[PDB]
Write an enzyme that holds these catalytic residues in place. Structure first.
Site, PDB file in Angstrom:
ATOM      1  N   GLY B 165      22.354  48.368   6.594  1.00 37.42           N
ATOM      2  CA  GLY B 165      22.643  47.686   7.844  1.00 37.42           C
ATOM      3  C   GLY B 165      21.563  46.692   8.210  1.00 37.42           C
ATOM      4  O   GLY B 165      21.012  45.987   7.358  1.00 37.42           O
ATOM      5  N   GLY B 166      21.257  46.632   9.507  1.00 33.04           N
ATOM      6  CA  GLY B 166      20.286  45.668   9.993  1.00 33.04           C
ATOM      7  C   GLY B 166      18.883  45.915   9.482  1.00 33.04           C
ATOM      8  O   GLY B 166      18.117  44.965   9.287  1.00 33.04           O
ATOM      9  N   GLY B 400       9.831  16.217 -16.951  1.00 29.80           N
ATOM     10  CA  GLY B 400       9.577  16.598 -15.573  1.00 29.80           C
ATOM     11  C   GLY B 400       8.951  17.972 -15.429  1.00 29.80           C
ATOM     12  O   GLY B 400       8.226  18.232 -14.463  1.00 29.80           O
ATOM     13  N   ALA B 401       9.232  18.872 -16.376  1.00 32.55           N
ATOM     14  CA  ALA B 401       8.603  20.189 -16.371  1.00 32.55           C
ATOM     15  C   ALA B 401       7.083  20.073 -16.386  1.00 32.55           C
ATOM     16  O   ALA B 401       6.386  20.850 -15.724  1.00 32.55           O
ATOM     17  CB  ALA B 401       9.104  21.006 -17.563  1.00 32.55           C
TER      18      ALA B 401
END
Ligand SMILES: CC(C)(COP(=O)(O)OP(=O)(O)OC[C@H]1O[C@@H](n2cnc3c(N)ncnc32)[C@H](O)[C@@H]1OP(=O)(O)O)[C@@H](O)C(=O)NCCC(=O)NCCS
Ligand SMILES: CC(C)(COP(=O)(O)OP(=O)(O)OC[C@H]1O[C@@H](n2cnc3c(N)ncnc32)[C@H](O)[C@@H]1OP(=O)(O)O)[C@@H](O)C(=O)NCCC(=O)NCCS
Ligand SMILES: *C(=O)CCCC[C@@H]1SC[C@@H]2NC(=O)N[C@@H]21
Ligand SMILES: *C(=O)CCCC[C@@H]1SC[C@@H]2NC(=O)N[C@@H]21
Lengths: 209, 506, 506
Positions: B165-166, B400-401
């Site tokens: 849940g939350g 670009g790497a």
């Protein structure tokens, strides 16, 4: 596994290593007040591959003194430094060299043809560790799937052959880089589906134990 | 008065002896035992032991348990101050009430005020349904504080049971999440709703277990075999980390020498360009004493991230790994590296980067999944950074790497290269095909052109000639050079322009 | 002198009249025509007309074209200063070189220095291969400056042709990316390598076309039919935006009235709860003159994000859309809304949010994809904001989703609710099945309990009793309330704690 005077020695060494590290660790910067105001517990529990040793550790000036429940003592001396793969020194009027490797919350030690995982706790930490259950691994089965798409460049095994965990079985090439597939379990080779020259997709069958 | 001792001993039993035994039977420790193991002996000071809930609906007024399902306080880890909370599964399933959240809020406020770390330990099932909207409000306030502390104090989360849940959104906004194998799981919606909506039948482990969150979903930073191991490793991690964004890294006395050479590294790179090697070997031969704390080890294994020490000071490491996907950068790896770089920059931790990259991962799956922006994240991180940056190219650095991996052009301070480095726009054959497109018919001529291009341009020397690389170094000196650089760089002073915040892609 | 006029006329031809006629035959404008259409008549001042390249490899010394493939300068849009560059596809395919990159860097630096917007128009193919590593260097210098300007001046990108390789990362780091249908595309790696490595056979349009980037990948904020429409819409957009992060939103004189009531809104919500309505109609009835500029319209259509005006001042809008996926929150919608909230806050634009949300989307696909973190992104963005926040709940607001959508608990200034608002932890059926599980066998008592829960809790009044809702208003007053509140909130003054930057999840 170790037994008799061997085990004892190993246990002592474990304690010493722990002690050394702890000392260094208590000199960390940024503490709320001075560490000299703290305390070191003397009573320790060394667990050695399912075998417990209750011990007491005391610094003898420069060396260490390890006392067991049987009243037998052991002085420990060495110049070992964290990072070195061999602990050489003296444990109670005897010269020894142990092979040390690191382990999660402990060490792995080899001496006199015996090997043991070694962990050092306090009493309370040990009794809390005794609440944790032993788990069994599921165990791989029956298949060797190709985890990456590529070409089969070599196969090193043959049908009807036995292999041990960690043994290479094939080589797959992808994006101009080889990839060695190793056996995850022990067994015998029954069948071979693919062989040199053929391209395989992800999760394809190479062989079956 | 002995009566106060009685009241305390009765608060210390949570929700019953039998529920505690049922917890021990699953292999799990209790909230208080977890606190006892995390902190130094005798250091724990507890807050709000006697707080109780004030709801009167659905018969809740008849079961008022002291502490309301959470244990809160502060202590020391290796002498340094820490704040903490630990949820109690035996008290209304660990669910969060108004008073529950108020306790957590008290300790969050105090941690931010005194500028010290905060550790949360989770074992619970979300908002207490009986307390209706009130419960939700509580959650909100906690969330607010998380965001206020982001980048000011380190926040660590440890999932040691159900988190549904939350609840899950609180750990999500913290710096590190760790999980215990076979007894913990996280999800937003549960299996029953999954069935009624999507017709899929799945167990809690299959939906949200440690394997899923450490290998597939990007959520978790690591898993451990059991509770004790996890807590001991949290103690280990805290000793690397700064206390806040002011004081800097902790310092310890080292047993290693900063002037030692390592001849073995001169053979690490193979002569065959298509055989891989293990970058981790290099990382573990460079750091002090071989000690390395890996982060997200099981996720995006084409890239390595973690903490080590040089000269007794914490340093962060990012490296390409040739063993997996040929070391290519993809979206998962880019996200993994980007968040690590951002954390280290926020808390003044220097970064070392080892580069061996041939390009990005091609295909429709990467493009339809948004690789453009995902790979832009890491570029953004490095270019925003003002902490020291030291980079070493061992092997390929194409396209670009090369720019992305902590290049001189995006703001790195020192850039070295081994003699085996190949810094170029792309591989030789493709470059020649593009340049000599009108003459791709002949064969021997193509081989000759490719040989020439490789001999001129697939090397470190064109980059050196332009000053993009500060020095070409022998492998065996790597540590010696790193340790010197970092020392000199400790005085770096730099700042970005004035702004509320950047607009990094998400 | 006539010789200078000659040199100018010659530079204005680019790569040749033939290539320009080929550009026109494809249905595209030239770079200079694009500049002419964007800027006010007579306002363009051009920089660096005569710049040339200095390479001496592969026979490039014998073709030195003035400009080096990009047109750069500054002008005005509706009287307000703007800086811009435009790539020239006829010159080496719009490829990026050293001098090219330096031209772009000049105008980037000037735009930051004078605190004015910058617009980049892309039609090119990346790093110029013949220049080798130097080309890459140039790219890096551009990237760095993009990052320096993020959150200081607005940066817009317009993709009007091919955009491949290292180029694509510069637009990625900008605030908005717009594309032209059927003539533009973006991808990191091209089809040839895709074929070689993956065996996929795909077209450029199928790999990185406008449909892909506007409906699947999350990269583009919008698309347009042709160049002219795109450029006119960019003018329109610039009229909404602040020049920089200090000056505040522009103001115009409005033809609408802030005190008008809208009776239609009283009948907008259907009586049957399983029937939807169009939230965009409410948006278009609340803004001045029905004018609304929508962002990322084609992606994650369960949520709406865009710009309007109230009392002649710009306002951002976020809203849940019941017509798609019942208005649930999912990862894509979370990221979409998060970037928009972050931009607004960075540039001091107020935000109005319309809430109708039943929860989150369930399933293994959402959980394995990282919904925990992707959903935390929006919570983070809202909780960090310091601009005015105004929220209106039209219908359902359940669970954590209620908290995430600009709740009082996360720092919203004013929170309103219509009479039809259902603010609750969950639906009545599920709530009773969880609460009254020990008696779920029966069916009559089940319906009784369901009805009583429905009557007590699925309304706005418990939230009103606790002070989470400032006022329950009538629908026909919505605009009238908003306009008043915003007017009062212009003086808001808040600050987040001191840090280099946050550590928002990625
Ligand atoms: C958290 C969860 C995964 C744990 O499930 P589990 O281990 O099988 O155990 P249980 O369901 O027995 O939970 C333990 C106890 O906590 C209570 N509890 C659990 N979650 C709670 C919550 N959110 N609010 C109130 N009480 C809660 C239980 O109802 C139960 O108490 P009991 O012993 O009196 O019956 C699951 O209960 C859960 O989803 N809870 C969240 C809310 C919800 O939707 N629950 C019911 C849907 S199945
Ligand atoms: C940008 C691109 C997608 C557009 O492709 P396209 O519309 O089919 O058109 P072309 O390839 O014919 O491009 C037009 C011209 O620009 C040139 N050009 C394009 N990109 C270039 C680059 N990066 N460097 C240098 N020149 C380049 C081409 O050589 C061609 O020149 P020409 O008319 O004299 O032959 C494409 O060319 C490309 O991918 N370029 C990047 C470099 C590359 O990888 N190319 C190989 C595959 S095309
Ligand atoms: C030769 O056979 C060409 C295939 C190798 C190309 C590789 S795939 C990984 C890198 N990505 C890319 O764009 N090119 C490189
Ligand atoms: C009734 O049929 C119950 C199932 C529908 C519940 C819907 S799914 C979308 C929202 N998410 C959630 O968890 N509940 C709501």
């Amino acid at each position: 596994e170790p037994e008799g005077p061997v085990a004892h020695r190993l246990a002592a060494v474990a304690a010493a290593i722990d002690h050394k590290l702890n000392i260094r660790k208590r000199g960390i910067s940024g503490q709320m007040r001075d560490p000299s105001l703290l305390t070191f517990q003397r009573e320790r529990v060394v667990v050695l591959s399912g075998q417990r040793f209750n011990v007491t550790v005391d610094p003898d000036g420069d060396d260490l003194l390890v006392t067991f429940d049987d009243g037998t003592t052991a002085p420990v001396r060495s110049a070992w430094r964290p990072g070195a793969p061999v602990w050489s020194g003296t444990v109670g009027d005897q010269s020894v060299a142990i092979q040390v490797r690191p382990l999660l919350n402990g060490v792995f030690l080899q001496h006199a043809g015996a090997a043991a995982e070694a962990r050092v706790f306090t009493r309370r930490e040990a009794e809390l560790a005794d609440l944790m259950p032993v788990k069994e691994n599921a165990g791989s089965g029956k298949q060797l799937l190709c985890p990456m798409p590529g070409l089969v460049k070599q196969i090193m095994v043959s049908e009807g052959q036995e292999v041990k965990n960690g043994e290479p079985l094939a080589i797959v090439e992808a994006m101009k880089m080889e990839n060695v597939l190793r056996a995850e379990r022990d067994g015998t080779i029954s069948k071979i589906a693919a062989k040199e020259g053929d391209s395989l997709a992800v999760d394809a069958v190479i062989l079956e134990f | 008065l002995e009566k106060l001792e009685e009241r305390r001993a009765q608060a210390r039993l949570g929700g019953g002896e039998k529920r505690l035994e049922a917890q021990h039977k699953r292999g799990k420790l209790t909230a208080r035992e977890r606190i006892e193991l995390l902190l130094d002996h005798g250091s724990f000071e507890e807050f709000d032991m006697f707080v109780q809930h004030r709801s009167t609906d659905f018969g809740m007024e008849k079961q008022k348990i002291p502490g309301d399902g959470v244990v809160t306080g502060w202590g020391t880890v290796n002498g340094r101050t820490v704040f903490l909370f630990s949820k109690d599964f035996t008290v209304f399933g660990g669910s969060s009430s108004e008073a529950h959240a108020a306790k957590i809020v008290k300790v969050q406020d105090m941690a931010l005020k005194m500028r010290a770390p905060i550790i949360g330990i989770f074992d619970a099932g979300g908002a207490r349904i009986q307390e209706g909207v009130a419960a939700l409000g509580g959650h909100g306030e906690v969330f607010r504080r998380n965001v206020a502390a982001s980048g000011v104090i380190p926040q660590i989360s440890v999932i040691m049971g159900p988190c549904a849940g939350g609840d899950v959104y609180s750990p999500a906004m913290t710096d590190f999440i760790f999980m215990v194998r076979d007894t913990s799981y996280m999800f937003v919606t549960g299996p029953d709703v999954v069935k009624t909506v999507t017709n899929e039948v799945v167990t809690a482990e299959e939906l949200g277990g440690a394997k899923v969150h450490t290998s597939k979903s990007s959520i978790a930073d690591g898993s451990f075999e059991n509770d004790v191991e996890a807590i001991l490793q949290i103690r280990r991690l805290l000793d690397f980390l700064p206390a806040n964004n002011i004081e800097g890294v902790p310092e310890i006395e080292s047993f290693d020498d900063v002037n030692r050479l390592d001849k073995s590294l001169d053979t690490l790179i193979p002569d065959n360009p298509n055989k891989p090697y293990d970058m981790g070997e290099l990382i573990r031969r460079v750091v002090d004493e071989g000690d390395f704390f890996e982060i997200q080890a099981a996720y995006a294994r084409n890239i390595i991230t973690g903490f080590g020490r040089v000269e007794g000071r914490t340093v962060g490491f990012v490296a390409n790994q040739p063993l997996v996907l040929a070391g290519v950068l993809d979206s998962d790896a880019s996200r993994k590296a980007a968040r690590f770089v951002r954390f280290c920059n926020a808390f003044s931790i220097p970064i070392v980067t080892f580069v061996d990259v041939p390009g990005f991962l091609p295909g429709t799956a990467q493009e339809y999944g948004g690789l453009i922006k995902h790979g832009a994240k890491l570029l953004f991180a490095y270019s925003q950074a003002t902490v020291p940056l030291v980079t070493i190219i061992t092997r390929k650095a194409f396209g670009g790497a090369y720019i992305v991996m902590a290049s001189k052009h995006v703001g790195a301070d020192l850039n070295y290269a081994w003699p085996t480095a190949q810094i170029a726009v792309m591989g030789a054959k493709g470059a020649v095909e593009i340049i000599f497109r009108a003459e791709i018919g002949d064969a021997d001529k193509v081989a000759e052109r490719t040989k020439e291009y490789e001999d001129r341009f697939l090397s470190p020397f064109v980059a050196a000639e332009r000053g993009y690389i500060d020095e070409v170094i022998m492998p065996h000196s790597t540590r010696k050079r790193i340790a010197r650089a970092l020392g000199m760089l400790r005085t770096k002073e730099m700042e970005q322009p004035r702004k509320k915040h950047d607009n990094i892609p998400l």
